[PDB]
Structure 1
Amino acid sequence: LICVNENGGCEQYCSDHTGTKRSCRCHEGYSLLADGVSCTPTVEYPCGKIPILEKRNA
């Protein structure tokens, strides 16, 4: 996988590494799941999410 393509399969941020390697990362206020791609909030008001809408679908 490569970051330039399909965002490396990452939900958020992606880094290429030496070899056939990639690491996904998450913004502050998120943590990376064991799938190595997905980001889940770790705080009440993470950036870039709309509370009234997140609740609306909760």
Structure 2
Amino acid sequence: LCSLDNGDCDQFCHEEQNSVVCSCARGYTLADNGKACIPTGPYPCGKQTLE
């Protein structure tokens, strides 16, 4: 079920055989925890700067 909280996925939540499966925008790669996204780069799209 994605619809509880995007299946706690930080970006693209989806469902595979009744299992939410998180994913991410190019630039990112899914943390091991399968929920989050680790920028595999210094300027991942979508995050503002000041950082």
Identify unmatched segments of 5+ residues in structure 2. Answer: none
Structure number having the greater helix percentage: 1
27, 34, 37: which one aligns with 1:36: 34
| Structure 1 runs of 4+ with >2 Å offset | none
Identify unmatched segments of 5+ residues in structure 1. Answer: none
Q: With structure 1 as the length reference, what TM-score do the two structures score?
A: 0.77
Q: Give the superposed CA RMSD.
A: 1.1
Aligned length: 51
User: Equivalent pairs: percent with the same residue?
Assistant: 41
Q: With structure 2 as the length reference, what TM-score do the two structures score?
A: 0.85
